[PDB]
Design a protein around this ligand. Sequence first.
Ligand SMILES: C[NH+](C)c1cc(NC(=O)CNC(C)(C)C)c(O)c2c1C[C@H]1C[C@H]3[C@H]([NH+](C)C)C(O)=C(C(N)=O)C(=O)[C@@]3(O)C(O)=C1C2=O
Ligand SMILES: C[NH+](C)c1cc(NC(=O)CNC(C)(C)C)c(O)c2c1C[C@H]1C[C@H]3[C@H]([NH+](C)C)C(O)=C(C(N)=O)C(=O)[C@@]3(O)C(O)=C1C2=O
Ligand SMILES: C[NH+](C)c1cc(NC(=O)CNC(C)(C)C)c(O)c2c1C[C@H]1C[C@H]3[C@H]([NH+](C)C)C(O)=C(C(N)=O)C(=O)[C@@]3(O)C(O)=C1C2=O
Ligand SMILES: C[NH+](C)c1cc(NC(=O)CNC(C)(C)C)c(O)c2c1C[C@H]1C[C@H]3[C@H]([NH+](C)C)C(O)=C(C(N)=O)C(=O)[C@@]3(O)C(O)=C1C2=O
Ligand SMILES: [Mg+2]
Ligand SMILES: [Mg+2]
Ligand SMILES: [Mg+2]
Ligand SMILES: [Mg+2]
Ligand SMILES: [Mg+2]
Ligand SMILES: [Mg+2]
Ligand SMILES: [Mg+2]
Ligand SMILES: [Mg+2]
Ligand SMILES: [Mg+2]
Ligand SMILES: [Mg+2]
Ligand SMILES: [Mg+2]
Ligand SMILES: [Mg+2]
Ligand SMILES: [Mg+2]
Ligand SMILES: [Mg+2]
Ligand SMILES: [Mg+2]
Ligand SMILES: [Mg+2]
Ligand SMILES: [Mg+2]
Ligand SMILES: [Mg+2]
Ligand SMILES: [Mg+2]
Ligand SMILES: [Mg+2]
Ligand SMILES: [Mg+2]
Ligand SMILES: [Mg+2]
Ligand SMILES: [Mg+2]
Ligand SMILES: [Mg+2]
Ligand SMILES: [Mg+2]
Ligand SMILES: [Mg+2]
Ligand SMILES: [Mg+2]
Ligand SMILES: [Mg+2]
Ligand SMILES: [Mg+2]
Ligand SMILES: [Mg+2]
Ligand SMILES: [Mg+2]
Ligand SMILES: [Mg+2]
Ligand SMILES: [Mg+2]
Ligand SMILES: [Mg+2]
Ligand SMILES: [Mg+2]
Ligand SMILES: [Mg+2]
Ligand SMILES: [Mg+2]
Ligand SMILES: [Mg+2]
Ligand SMILES: [Mg+2]
Ligand SMILES: [Mg+2]
Ligand SMILES: [Mg+2]
Ligand SMILES: [Mg+2]
Ligand SMILES: [Mg+2]
Ligand SMILES: [Mg+2]
Ligand SMILES: [Mg+2]
Ligand SMILES: [Mg+2]
Ligand SMILES: [Mg+2]
Ligand SMILES: [Mg+2]
Ligand SMILES: [Mg+2]
Ligand SMILES: [Mg+2]
Ligand SMILES: [Mg+2]
Ligand SMILES: [Mg+2]
Ligand SMILES: [Mg+2]
Ligand SMILES: [Mg+2]
Ligand SMILES: [Mg+2]
Ligand SMILES: [Mg+2]
Ligand SMILES: [Mg+2]
Ligand SMILES: [Mg+2]
Ligand SMILES: [Mg+2]
Ligand SMILES: [Mg+2]
Ligand SMILES: [Mg+2]
Ligand SMILES: [Mg+2]
Ligand SMILES: [Mg+2]
Ligand SMILES: [Zn+2]
Lengths: 209, 105, 112, 58, 159
Amino acid sequence: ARRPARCYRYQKNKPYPKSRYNRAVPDSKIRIYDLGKKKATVDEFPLCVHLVSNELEQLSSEALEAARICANKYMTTVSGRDAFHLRVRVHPFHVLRINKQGMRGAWGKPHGLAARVDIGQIIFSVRTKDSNKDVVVEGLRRARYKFPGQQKIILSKKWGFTNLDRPEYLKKREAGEVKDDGAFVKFLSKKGSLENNIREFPEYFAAQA
Amino acid sequence: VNVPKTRKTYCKGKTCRKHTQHKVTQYKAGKASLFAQGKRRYDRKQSGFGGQTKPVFHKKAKTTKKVVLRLECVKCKTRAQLTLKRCKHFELGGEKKQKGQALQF
Amino acid sequence: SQRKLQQDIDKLLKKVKEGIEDFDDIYEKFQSTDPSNSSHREKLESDLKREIKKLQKHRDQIKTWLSKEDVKDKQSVLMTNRRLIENGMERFKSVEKLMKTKQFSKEALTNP
Amino acid sequence: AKSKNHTAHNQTRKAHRNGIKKPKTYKYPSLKGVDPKFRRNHKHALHGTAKALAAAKK
Amino acid sequence: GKSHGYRSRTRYMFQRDFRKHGAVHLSTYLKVYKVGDIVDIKANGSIQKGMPHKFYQGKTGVVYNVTKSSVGVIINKMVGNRYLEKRLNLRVEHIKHSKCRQEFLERVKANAAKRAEAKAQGVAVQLKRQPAQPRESRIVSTEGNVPQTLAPVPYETFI
RNA sequence: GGUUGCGGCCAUAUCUACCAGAAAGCACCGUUUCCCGUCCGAUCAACUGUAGUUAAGCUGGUAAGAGCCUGACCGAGUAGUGUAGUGGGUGACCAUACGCGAAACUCAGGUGCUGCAAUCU
RNA sequence: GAAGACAUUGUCAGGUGGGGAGUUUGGCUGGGGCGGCACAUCUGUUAAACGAUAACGCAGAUGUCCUAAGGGGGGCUCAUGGAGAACAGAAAUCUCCAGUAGAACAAAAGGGUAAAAGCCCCCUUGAUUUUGAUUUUCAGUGUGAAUACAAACCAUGAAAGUGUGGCCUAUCGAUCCUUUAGUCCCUCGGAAUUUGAGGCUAGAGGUGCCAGAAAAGUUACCACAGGGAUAACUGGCUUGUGGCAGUCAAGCGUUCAUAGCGACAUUGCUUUUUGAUUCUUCGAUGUCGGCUCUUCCUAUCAUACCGAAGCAGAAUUCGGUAA
RNA sequence: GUGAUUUCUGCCCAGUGCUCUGAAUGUCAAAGUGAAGAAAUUCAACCAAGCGCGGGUAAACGGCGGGAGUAACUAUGACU
RNA sequence: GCCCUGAAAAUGGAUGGCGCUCAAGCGUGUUACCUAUACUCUACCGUCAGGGUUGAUAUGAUGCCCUGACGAGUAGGCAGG
RNA sequence: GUCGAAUUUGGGUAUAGGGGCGAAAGACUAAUCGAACCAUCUAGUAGCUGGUUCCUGCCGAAGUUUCCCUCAGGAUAGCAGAAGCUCGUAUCAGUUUUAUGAGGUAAAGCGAAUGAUUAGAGGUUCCGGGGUCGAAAUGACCUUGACCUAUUCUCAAACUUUAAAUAUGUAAGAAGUCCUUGUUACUUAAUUGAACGUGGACAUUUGAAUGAAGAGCUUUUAGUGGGCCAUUUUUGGUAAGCAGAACUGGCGAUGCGGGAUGAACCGAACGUAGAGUUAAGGUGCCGGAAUACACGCUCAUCAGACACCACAAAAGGUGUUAG
RNA sequence: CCUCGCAAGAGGUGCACAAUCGACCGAUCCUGAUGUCUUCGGAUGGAUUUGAGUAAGAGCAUAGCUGUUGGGACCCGAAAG
RNA sequence: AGCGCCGUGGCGCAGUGGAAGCGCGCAGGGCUCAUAACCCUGAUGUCCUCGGAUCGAAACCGAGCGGCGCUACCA
Ligand SMILES: C[NH+](C)c1cc(NC(=O)CNC(C)(C)C)c(O)c2c1C[C@H]1C[C@H]3[C@H]([NH+](C)C)C(O)=C(C(N)=O)C(=O)[C@@]3(O)C(O)=C1C2=O
Ligand SMILES: C[NH+](C)c1cc(NC(=O)CNC(C)(C)C)c(O)c2c1C[C@H]1C[C@H]3[C@H]([NH+](C)C)C(O)=C(C(N)=O)C(=O)[C@@]3(O)C(O)=C1C2=O
Ligand SMILES: C[NH+](C)c1cc(NC(=O)CNC(C)(C)C)c(O)c2c1C[C@H]1C[C@H]3[C@H]([NH+](C)C)C(O)=C(C(N)=O)C(=O)[C@@]3(O)C(O)=C1C2=O
Ligand SMILES: C[NH+](C)c1cc(NC(=O)CNC(C)(C)C)c(O)c2c1C[C@H]1C[C@H]3[C@H]([NH+](C)C)C(O)=C(C(N)=O)C(=O)[C@@]3(O)C(O)=C1C2=O
Ligand SMILES: [Mg+2]
Ligand SMILES: [Mg+2]
Ligand SMILES: [Mg+2]
Ligand SMILES: [Mg+2]
Ligand SMILES: [Mg+2]
Ligand SMILES: [Mg+2]
Ligand SMILES: [Mg+2]
Ligand SMILES: [Mg+2]
Ligand SMILES: [Mg+2]
Ligand SMILES: [Mg+2]
Ligand SMILES: [Mg+2]
Ligand SMILES: [Mg+2]
Ligand SMILES: [Mg+2]
Ligand SMILES: [Mg+2]
Ligand SMILES: [Mg+2]
Ligand SMILES: [Mg+2]
Ligand SMILES: [Mg+2]
Ligand SMILES: [Mg+2]
Ligand SMILES: [Mg+2]
Ligand SMILES: [Mg+2]
Ligand SMILES: [Mg+2]
Ligand SMILES: [Mg+2]
Ligand SMILES: [Mg+2]
Ligand SMILES: [Mg+2]
Ligand SMILES: [Mg+2]
Ligand SMILES: [Mg+2]
Ligand SMILES: [Mg+2]
Ligand SMILES: [Mg+2]
Ligand SMILES: [Mg+2]
Ligand SMILES: [Mg+2]
Ligand SMILES: [Mg+2]
Ligand SMILES: [Mg+2]
Ligand SMILES: [Mg+2]
Ligand SMILES: [Mg+2]
Ligand SMILES: [Mg+2]
Ligand SMILES: [Mg+2]
Ligand SMILES: [Mg+2]
Ligand SMILES: [Mg+2]
Ligand SMILES: [Mg+2]
Ligand SMILES: [Mg+2]
Ligand SMILES: [Mg+2]
Ligand SMILES: [Mg+2]
Ligand SMILES: [Mg+2]
Ligand SMILES: [Mg+2]
Ligand SMILES: [Mg+2]
Ligand SMILES: [Mg+2]
Ligand SMILES: [Mg+2]
Ligand SMILES: [Mg+2]
Ligand SMILES: [Mg+2]
Ligand SMILES: [Mg+2]
Ligand SMILES: [Mg+2]
Ligand SMILES: [Mg+2]
Ligand SMILES: [Mg+2]
Ligand SMILES: [Mg+2]
Ligand SMILES: [Mg+2]
Ligand SMILES: [Mg+2]
Ligand SMILES: [Mg+2]
Ligand SMILES: [Mg+2]
Ligand SMILES: [Mg+2]
Ligand SMILES: [Mg+2]
Ligand SMILES: [Mg+2]
Ligand SMILES: [Mg+2]
Ligand SMILES: [Mg+2]
Ligand SMILES: [Zn+2]
């Protein structure tokens, strides 16, 4: 057993997901996808760090869980559990097949589950404070070893996971059109109703600081 | 399938070329008489030495026969044939199905 | 082969018919037991139970035949022997229940 | 002894070596499949206009 | 195992358009087709009687026969090394006119007009269409428009 | 221009919440002998236009409304793609040349038009 | 002497009769066999946005069922959710509101359908007759299925209209033979009448290997024509599997990731494993093991020289140049 | 058929054969008999043997169980 | 970017070989040169097409002459020898 | 091994081919035996193997469709040749444009429907399971599950609002347009329309571009009906010089120059010669042609050296160079 | 081909042939006149029907290439019966 | 690996669309000095699990779990 990712590496087949035509597939081994202080705010975590791909390939659900475990262990041993929020941004939806006389009836049974990653696609995202840039970089360097192919750390200059580069987001915050939700934020748009906009963003519609 | 004993269809008779009452029965094949030319030819060919000389059918595949109704128009006493499809069960003038009675299990 | 299949058909057909004959003979001797011979009643129960169990095995074979085996001609006679076996089954069930029922059991005290 | 099942190779080359040229339309296409009602009238009207043209020509 | 039915591989072909289900309208019921006209065949899935085959979907032909509720359309189809003429009996829901044909009629009316005044005053008929001819010499004004200089941008990653 | 009858395109026409509606017209409305239909004159049928009411329907307007529609040099000439190379790269794939070219997104605007006839302060 | 119109014999008829005779013992196929039907068909996908398109490709279905589940007309709106009403509760019946279909339409699947194509009610038999034309499969042959008319006769509706079976896409069958219906027509040939028979027009009885032979095995006693179109050796491509080697480092090692190891992953090499394939060879390449003998490779067991150790010595372990 | 001597050759006739009976109140050819017909012919009844029914036969061909629980340690299972 | 470690197979061995190190290697650019049965021009052979020429003397009108284009070839077809 | 017998043997005699004879091996029956030998039927049949005899010229394929007890074969259509025939009189394009259609792939989307799926937030329980305050209460507090609302992360060959590029249908007129009035048994309430017409009008271009090498038509017949490779799209498989499709081009059927070598790659297709110029590829020598020029990089104690193509990766290196 | 015209072109006639609408003959399905052995005759007029037909004949015979079939069938070749 | 069968009370087994039983065990009473045997009674089930068709099943149709049996041949 345990055929290599070198023979399940490239994207050769069409996406073959779990559906009503394909049942009795084994479960993925990755079950948790967000990690660290996942209830924190983008207020608390300004800097984003992205592990991105350079190859059009397939990532095993095993490679995802192993990279997540090693990265997690490194950041908790160094910087503690609450200093980061790590989210894996690929979900294994590909049922890989195994054949297991001759080539007659060669259509194979389900064997796995894979994340088809494109060039320039986020694999790992870590949001953290400005002082933990080093430790999140070396944790994602450990992640780059359990993951096949070539990957890059890009210092994402978006405030947290969201959008909206840091001066733009600072301007939005000091304008007051940003409301703190659970692990995310809500934005004021100039297209909704006046009454519900009033009752959901009082600070923009007041003379507050 | 259920078919009524009576039916108003077209009549080919010259005295009435319109729709008229027909009584419905089922076509049953004839007696297969001994003096048909094919039967006489078969008897002469099978007589003698040489065994069976014509093929006899063995690889039966279908279970159903198409039903064909002999309609007799009741004024000019004339007959016609109407073919209905492969049905396992066939009744002439059975009880009508009823819309909405209590089922009786 | 279809010839071998139809041979096994005809064999089980004949076995079912002779089983039905001797089951009916045991049934009529049961109904004419003279029920003071309760031991003879119980003996005839056990004998027709054995015969109806043999008919159970034959009927299950008929089930498998009509389900998967491509009988291809004789579904009529297979179904008729199935129906004969099942009416024998219900006769055995009625007789068997009749002597099972205890005279002061709660079912007989509820409804005669 | 398996062999090749189906292929459309070389077929367009054969067809265009002896091309698809035209269905060769004519004036007065065939009246096959046109309505018998008003086909009978077309017969009668052509008879009438031929008779009228001959009578006017004398 | 393998199927070639009358409506095989016609799923999205005979689907209705989004928010265009229901009854088909009285414009396409009240349009009139006369013998010899040019029509486009696009099947309507709601009317199952008189549907064309999937081959004739989106196909332009000449109507040659008109009857109670349908019209007969002549279509040339390529089989083998020759075109064959096919006579389809199609309902007016599946039959639609040809805007190219109507534009040819407005063009021939315009051409007959243009030759009429061209003959009336006696010069410059010039009826036939000409393709897009090369552009001619022009003068552009720098007054109010000084050419602003452009440079290629550096490589900045946005993610 | 409002309204009614018949419509064409079938949301710019729909949906939600309020507000207004002179005149006329629709509408709600009043009644069960007759034709007729229902468990029920509620629907339907018939009769009256009388006893009344714009409360609803309907029409119109409002809403940083939802939806829908139109446009943008907004995204984006991006994704994708036809053709070409003894181009690059171990490969996966990626640039370049001649061409075509989106969708989502964002922003701005709009919220039925119209035909035949009749009628109306 | 016995037997006697019985045996015997002759001709027909029924039975028995592998003792013998003659013949047959499907096809596709990652070799054949076993398995399966991809053999006649239907749906979605493969299929690369006209059409066509393969594999023992994927997910399924067919050999039926229906006098209504066909045809016409009228009325109504479904699944579900919420709020209520004695017994009555999660679910019995009744009422209202919301409800673009989230229901139903015989079945597989895909389309289609809302004053309907659904549900209920009324009336019916057009699921009728005569042959033609057209579409799909396609050779533009047949079969099957379908479309639009024409000439009748009808059904329904106030009518416009609709109706030549099932809302649409599957649900099926030549010659010869038999049989039925019609014409009661033609012929039985020296001339008639009546039975009988043969014809003509339209059906049915069936070939599922579904363009349609009447059909069991075995050969280790075998034969012939051939085949590398096709297997069992080697060789060749590939390396799943086998074997070998890296990288990462959670941990083990008292303490300490890396003395020695090393999980979870991940990258390779090899052709000494077994497969996969079928390119060469079936007018033959002698086919297992052993003996015998030579050479080569290194991925080093020993020996030479070294480095490291949780190497005090001894013993041992890891590694290097080295065949 | 088995294969000197010695010692033995168990159970099964349901199946396949073989063999007995004889009218089962079955099937049953030709010839013959009766009826209808104008006749060819058709329909009846009768209908031998054999199949069928009913016995016997295995030194004829041949065949000759499965699952549970159970004894003062465990195991096993005389036993159920 | 290049180079190096990773990087181990069995006859002796192959950037084709010799050899090459500010290359005769790699990346790029500029010219010059070499060379095909390809292209241009000419001649000749054949085929095809279009055409001219019964006038007297001398011969063949299926003949003579002009113009242009073309020429690969298995299975196979036809033609002239 | 046996050697006094179930012994060995001579001669005579008997048994003959579906027969004999067999202490049984399918043994033997004149070197022949799982059915002898001889002659004839017989030149038996073969969809199978091999061979098939002079030259030159011109043209020049197919390995595909459908059916077949069809899969080593035929028929049929297709490709090809020959004979031509009717005209050279406005015809057609493996092409583009303009105009108008059609499509549901690539992409995209999921705070759009279906299905999958990550994470919190706010709520709702006359109505989930726990505990606490509780006698309980249409009581209260907290915990955990669901249901709703607004968000978030990622997806779909058999999901989709949207939606390309490339391919694809039609039209671009004389068989056309306009005016007037003739026919009809069709149609209309109706000289109303429909179809076909008569007689006039219309042109400079007769209604986009480009090219035509003649255009159209018929008959008959050969061979073929094993294919294979390359780019791109693509299915099964770990992959394959694997199996199976789509479009195009090639090999087969084809030499020549280059890739040292090679059926397919690059260039270019071929009468016999001469001259010139080039393609692809090259110019140290083999080897024709610059040990040319210019800017750099690399020193390898296994350098590297040119597409198909005859391989190398992850991970590293104060080696060096530039950022 | 004819007429006009210098020609361009205008008209007339137009064989073969091609397309189409008709007419006639046979079959099928109708309609059913004068009439009459009162059961025979089938006039006339039709029909999305059908024929391998008519519509101022083209065939017959011979020879040749090619092709088909049957014969040993291009030549050689079985195991068999 | 394929094919086929089986799965129901504590154990061994039946069971067809109107729907759960047999025998032995188990429980209560009786008889007996007592225990068996015998007599009179009673109770006993996620019908292997999950989903679907049906107005409804354990049964019909599908997915898995578990246990058996047959085949795996020519070299
Ligand atoms: C008088 N009976 C007893 C008889 C006797 C003899 N033979 C003798 O006389 C000699 N036998 C003795 C000495 C008495 C033992 C007989 O020989 C006969 C018969 C009877 C017939 C019966 C026939 C009859 N048929 C006409 C239907 C019948 O019932 C059967 C039958 N199916 O059983 C017959 O076979 C029958 O035809 C027949 O064969 C008889 C005799 O031969
Ligand atoms: C015992 N014998 C007397 C006999 C009696 C009867 N009759 C009866 O049993 C009648 N009794 C009843 C009531 C039916 C039970 C019989 O019926 C018979 C027979 C015996 C045979 C005679 C046979 C005989 N054969 C052997 C030559 C004969 O003459 C004929 C014949 N040529 O007709 C037979 O066929 C015979 O075999 C025969 O049928 C007999 C009986 O059946
Ligand atoms: C210009 N000429 C050479 C010509 C050419 C063509 N066709 C072409 O264009 C050539 N076709 C190619 C492009 C080569 C395929 C042509 O098609 C024609 C004609 C000529 C005309 C002459 C017509 C004329 N009238 C009626 C205008 C005439 O005098 C007669 C007559 N009365 O007999 C004709 O014959 C005429 O009608 C005619 O036939 C011509 C053409 O068809
Ligand atoms: C498009 N041009 C090339 C053309 C085409 C066709 N033919 C067709 O299109 C045929 N139609 C089909 C496609 C068959 C349905 C044509 O038939 C014609 C013509 C051209 C005209 C020219 C006319 C012109 N007149 C008006 C003065 C002219 O110059 C002469 C002349 N005097 O020589 C003509 O020949 C002319 O009158 C004419 O006859 C033409 C055509 O017939
Ligand atoms: Mg005989
Ligand atoms: Mg083939
Ligand atoms: Mg196939
Ligand atoms: Mg569409
Ligand atoms: Mg229909
Ligand atoms: Mg035999
Ligand atoms: Mg085979
Ligand atoms: Mg397509
Ligand atoms: Mg219906
Ligand atoms: Mg309705
Ligand atoms: Mg057909
Ligand atoms: Mg009709
Ligand atoms: Mg007959
Ligand atoms: Mg038939
Ligand atoms: Mg067939
Ligand atoms: Mg044999
Ligand atoms: Mg053998
Ligand atoms: Mg063998
Ligand atoms: Mg032997
Ligand atoms: Mg081979
Ligand atoms: Mg092998
Ligand atoms: Mg390996
Ligand atoms: Mg391995
Ligand atoms: Mg091989
Ligand atoms: Mg060999
Ligand atoms: Mg040899
Ligand atoms: Mg040899
Ligand atoms: Mg070494
Ligand atoms: Mg014995
Ligand atoms: Mg026995
Ligand atoms: Mg016996
Ligand atoms: Mg008899
Ligand atoms: Mg007897
Ligand atoms: Mg290296
Ligand atoms: Mg060199
Ligand atoms: Mg250089
Ligand atoms: Mg010439
Ligand atoms: Mg002697
Ligand atoms: Mg011998
Ligand atoms: Mg056949
Ligand atoms: Mg061969
Ligand atoms: Mg002309
Ligand atoms: Mg177009
Ligand atoms: Mg599609
Ligand atoms: Mg996509
Ligand atoms: Mg989109
Ligand atoms: Mg979604
Ligand atoms: Mg002209
Ligand atoms: Mg041919
Ligand atoms: Mg052929
Ligand atoms: Mg060849
Ligand atoms: Mg070449
Ligand atoms: Mg190229
Ligand atoms: Mg030269
Ligand atoms: Mg030189
Ligand atoms: Mg590297
Ligand atoms: Mg470096
Ligand atoms: Mg010969
Ligand atoms: Mg011959
Ligand atoms: Mg011979
Ligand atoms: Mg023979
Ligand atoms: Mg007790
Ligand atoms: Mg006791
Ligand atoms: Zn009648």
